[model samples]
Target: ASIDAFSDLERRMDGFQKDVAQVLARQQNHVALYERLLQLRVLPGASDVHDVRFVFGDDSRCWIEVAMHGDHVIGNSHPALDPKSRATLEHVLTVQGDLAAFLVVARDMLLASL
Candidate 1:
């Protein structure tokens, strides 16, 4: 069932990713970030920041918990954020150095519905 777990993880990750990008989409930072939001997949239970997960890097190997849902990764240092999540997006975006690439993945993940 490893594949199944991965499948479930993928689905939840997609949902989480969509939720994140959509929320990020509303932010004023990086005008095109939202446009890119539609192309990622966030995995749940991986990191417990805001019940969301994000990955980055050329290897696509970085992972982090989503702390903020509105406009950015808010409450990262706040107690409400609990585990105290930090911003992983910019790092990821910078790692790839291509907004289009990130955005495409974001879109693919967001459009994937259960």
Candidate 2:
């Protein structure tokens, strides 16, 4: 069998995604809450998007707002790790010394980390 870097890269990507989900789950300790986090991520990328918001408040019907440019997301009543109505977040926010830019970034980062 031949060892290839692709195998490790793929595993790392998948791990990143799983890690994010797990962190969020641990934050709320509820698997069901995962959907809410996803909804927040899929809000909108630009103002051109007709509907650029999602159900975000502690009550879900409190009219929370969401806006994102590329991967940065700013929402109403944001979560703890990302708790800000308006924020400027990078597409890839990883730990210091962990896949800075060599191995992955953005979606690729999640792909490798997961």
Strongest candidate by TM-score: 1
For 1-114, candidate 1 gives per-residue lDDT tens digits of 687578788898999989988887745766357425533344573435456554433333333444444444422211122221123334345455565554444434333421
Using lDDT, give the best candidate's number.
1
Cα lDDT of model 2 by residue, 20-92, tens digit: 8887764554545665554323343234432454433344422223343444343333233232212222222
Lowest lDDT sum, 10 consecutive residues, model 1, at 77-86
CA lDDT scores, all candidates in order: 0.45, 0.38
TM-score of 1: 0.23
Q: Candidate 1: lDDT of 57?
A: 32
Candidate 1, residue 3: how far the Cα is off, in Å:
54
